[PDB]
Design an enzyme around this catalytic site. Structure first.
Site, PDB file in Angstrom:
ATOM      1  N   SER D  42       0.794  -1.220   0.000  1.00 42.73           N
ATOM      2  CA  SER D  42       0.000   0.000   0.000  1.00 42.73           C
ATOM      3  C   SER D  42       0.831   1.277   0.000  1.00 42.73           C
ATOM      4  O   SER D  42       0.249   2.362  -0.101  1.00 42.73           O
ATOM      5  CB  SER D  42      -0.946   0.003   1.199  1.00 42.73           C
ATOM      6  N   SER D 100      -5.631   3.779   3.965  1.00 44.84           N
ATOM      7  CA  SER D 100      -5.122   2.799   3.007  1.00 44.84           C
ATOM      8  C   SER D 100      -6.266   2.138   2.244  1.00 44.84           C
ATOM      9  O   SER D 100      -6.268   0.928   2.005  1.00 44.84           O
ATOM     10  CB  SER D 100      -4.248   1.753   3.700  1.00 44.84           C
ATOM     11  N   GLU D 140      -5.345  -3.087  -6.939  1.00 42.44           N
ATOM     12  CA  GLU D 140      -5.708  -3.664  -5.647  1.00 42.44           C
ATOM     13  C   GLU D 140      -6.799  -4.712  -5.843  1.00 42.44           C
ATOM     14  O   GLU D 140      -7.769  -4.459  -6.568  1.00 42.44           O
ATOM     15  CB  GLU D 140      -6.168  -2.577  -4.675  1.00 42.44           C
ATOM     16  N   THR D 209       1.862   3.247   5.375  1.00 44.60           N
ATOM     17  CA  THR D 209       2.168   1.847   5.610  1.00 44.60           C
ATOM     18  C   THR D 209       1.767   0.990   4.416  1.00 44.60           C
ATOM     19  O   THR D 209       0.965   1.386   3.568  1.00 44.60           O
ATOM     20  CB  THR D 209       1.457   1.339   6.862  1.00 44.60           C
ATOM     21  N   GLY D 210       2.346  -0.205   4.364  1.00 42.54           N
ATOM     22  CA  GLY D 210       1.958  -1.207   3.394  1.00 42.54           C
ATOM     23  C   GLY D 210       1.990  -2.587   4.012  1.00 42.54           C
ATOM     24  O   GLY D 210       2.915  -2.908   4.767  1.00 42.54           O
ATOM     25  N   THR D 211       0.985  -3.408   3.720  1.00 45.47           N
ATOM     26  CA  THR D 211       0.905  -4.754   4.266  1.00 45.47           C
ATOM     27  C   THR D 211       0.346  -5.694   3.209  1.00 45.47           C
ATOM     28  O   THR D 211      -0.582  -5.335   2.480  1.00 45.47           O
ATOM     29  CB  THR D 211       0.029  -4.802   5.527  1.00 45.47           C
TER      30      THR D 211
END
Ligand SMILES: *C(=O)/C=C/N[C@@H](C(=O)O)C(C)(C)S(=O)O
Ligand SMILES: *C(=O)/C=C/N[C@@H](C(=O)O)C(C)(C)S(=O)O
Lengths: 265, 265, 265, 265
Positions: D42, D100, D140, D209-211
């Site tokens: 993200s 996000s 996504e 953030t990215g996950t």
């Protein structure tokens, strides 16, 4: 005579104010639009956790619930983080009170079971506590955006204050369960600018907030004098005439709380 | 009717309460025993500093004053530390406001010069801002232990509030000198449990406390609402009937201040 | 190699820095000027409470100690308020740690009894813990202003870190007494800008600060990682070459603490 | 040196760490697997917003976009609520950064237009900032689940740090457009447990953030020392070898950020 100050605040903030402070042994009840219907918004999450606690053993909190990305349908600061790991009913309770997590509330409603995904079961639980007025009909996030005048997903300050009083100060829950609800509301993160802001710092404050469209801003709370006397303060507000997109005014709730604090002193 | 709450607070704490809040443009004046004489105690140290400032240049603050251990006659947390080095007028001003240093006040009084060790000069300065009631007759510490009924070393909430209003909000000092007084009162250390404890934390509070025998406890303050509206609050209290050794009740001043805050909200 | 970053801070802040972190089970010790003498300042007040705790039953905390206006010889934010009432040994402990009350420390020293008003009794109690280096020779406020080079009223980071490790993490006190010292240090009000400011917020920090002339600024602390590993961090500094009036630089301690945090992560 | 602590954190958390801090005027660059490819996840939503901003006027933020319930294909806490009213590009920007929001990201991509639903237009905009390495190939949520070793939808900590440096510190946007990006990152709600958790609280942190699957967890952030010096910190991690279902470990990113903080102090 304090009802002149409240009506002055309603004029100042272009809003409708509802206030109820249940009468204690020494002091008298405080009422302003106390039997007028306001939207629950997120305040329902406080007796929702109490409903799950009352219906289940303490070890039901370690049960793991898993959910999909399609269940994240509202602001869910904690449920969003644990879509892959899942969360236990205890963490769902912690999230639904302290972070007002929308998704955590919907799964907790589902754990209650029954028609409407648990809304009927929840309204039933409120009835058992003597609340004849309140009613929950939708789940998150539809409950927040009911049209004004519609009686769905509403409570009253009088009704919600008496529910909170039993749950925190009364005997609706056994002491070991009552202490978990109390601790979660004591470590709440969403209400620093409302009733907490209206009371002096040496007054202890536990609360659950509620916000939604039409300028809806609620805060239900239990407060303790520096000498230890506990009071229940239900403050609810909306700005429905200002339309769907009206901004809530948290200053109204803090100011109202300061009016109450002077009377309780 | 707020006058009932103050007389209730008098009955609950076994004391005599004096409250004055000067009327502003928006709100009306608050009065309770407002024109009854209470003892200055250490609250006089606020207009004392402003007296030295008004009569002297700013460079007069760098003048060094030396003293002997025979001059330490009252609670002097700061003066006791510098008996061999001495203190400048500026430090003597800082000490007398923020720590209510007794000896620093007596030296500042001597810096006003004249009869009674500068008391006559100080009352005269009190007549120049329009206060014909107040009077200072003794030095520290005798001024704290006058018998009740005696008019020596006494002010009134009405009289002391208007003095403070001129000194912090008005034009009794030039802006450069007006900021030093306010900065010392802002970082005061002796009044956390009085007026500061009775107002919400998003109100700003500057104060000078006073304490003495017969349960005498005072706090004179300038407060600022969260939107910036300033007010003057003068709270004085004694417990003369309890006699010379009566304990002062700080909770009374905090409780009275919460009542004021509720009205001002 | 972390000794390069410390010496860079010494150059930047015009100051001498002392840092000790006792070696834990997994990680190695951290030393910088760790066996060089720094002035106790008010850091001695932490084991002083422990010395009173160790030498007395828990009900000795209820003993009421009364004092006069001539005992207030230093900054005493709490003792100045209770000259008329007196304070219990429990409150004297609470004040000496949480507000670094100078008079409360002197009364606690007197409760130890013995020569020098109890300084010898205190130095003996450190010897029982295995501290062969430290020494307390004066009372407040003379101990904060010894000349540089003078060994009086001096500890070392190595020595003070191991004293604190026994008092909080070791067995130098029974559990019911050990939890009282810990809780007072956890609710300290004087050290928000030092080791607390250098560590992330999800690290727990208990501390006692010290400050004095010659830019002396110390902070002794026990910290806990987010997973629960405890560490002891002794940080001391002075600026003696800058003269008696040199200002202490709290930023140096918070920065040094951020260097330690990186190593302990 | 610091690279041994990173490999120790690698062993302890069963992961592969990627750390880059662009060198400033004063400090040197921090590198650890800095030119090794990690998945965007993200974190691309950060330069995605800046892309829309850069090639459009401010008035384009008020354009209304409508979408179906069939377009909700990933975690979309904000896009789920507005399926019947629609969202404007400005709201879609706010959602894609602060929550996000997956569906907001895909709509903003389609707002860039072109092949692959605007993936090509995005990588193209990245090449304009000098980023030769990074690439976005999917929408996504498919981009979060590419196999390890595969170069699609990947950046590097070196490559993602310098873009963010230009986009917050440099001239990649006019000031009026640069402040919208910054303010959305500053009020982010998805990264309290990562870089924000590793730096002391008196450091300001903005982040995205990215996950994703395979234990992927990233955080790209701009931080500000208490005195005002800004840095860029790129932290990326995954746990291939542990499987598609490997759980991400946020404690690794917070720990790594604490190591960075110690060096920068
Ligand atoms: C409880 O029902 C309320 C949530 N209110 C806010 C939230 O934090 O989610 C809003 C206003 C964003 S919402 O109506 O989802
Ligand atoms: C111990 O570290 C205490 C300092 N408190 C005061 C005191 O009275 O000693 C100060 C701040 C005046 S000092 O640095 O001596």
């Amino acid at each position: 005579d304090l009802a002149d100050r409240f009506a002055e605040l309603e004029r100042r903030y272009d809003a409708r104010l509802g206030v109820y402070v249940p009468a204690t042994g020494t002091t008298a009840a405080i009422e302003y639009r106390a039997d007028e219907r306001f939207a629950f918004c997120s305040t329902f999450k406080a007796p929702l956790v109490a409903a799950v606690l009352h219906q289940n053993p303490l070890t039901h909190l370690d049960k793991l619930i898993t959910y999909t990305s399609d269940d994240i349908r509202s602001i869910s600061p904690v449920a969003q983080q644990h879509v892959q790991t899942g969360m236990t009913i205890g963490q769902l309770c912690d999230a639904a009170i302290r972070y007002s997590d929308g998704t955590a509330a919907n799964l907790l409603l589902a754990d209650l079971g029954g028609p409407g995904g648990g809304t009927a079961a929840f309204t039933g639980y409120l009835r058992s506590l003597g609340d004849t007025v309140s009613r929950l009909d939708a789940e998150e996030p539809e409950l927040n955006r009911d049209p004004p005048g519609d009686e769905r997903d509403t409570t009253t300050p009088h009704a919600i204050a008496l529910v909170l009083q039993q749950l925190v100060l009364g005997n609706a829950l056994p002491p070991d369960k009552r202490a978990l609800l109390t601790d979660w509301m004591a470590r709440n993160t969403t209400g620093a600018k409302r009733i907490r802001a209206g009371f002096p710092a040496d007054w202890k404050v536990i609360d659950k907030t509620g916000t939604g469209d039409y300028g809806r801003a609620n805060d239900i709370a239990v407060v303790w004098s520096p000498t230890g006397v506990p009071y229940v303060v239900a403050v609810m507000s909306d700005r429905a005439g200002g339309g769907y997109d009206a901004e809530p005014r948290e200053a109204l709730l803090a100011e109202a709380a300061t009016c109450v604090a002077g009377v309780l002193a």
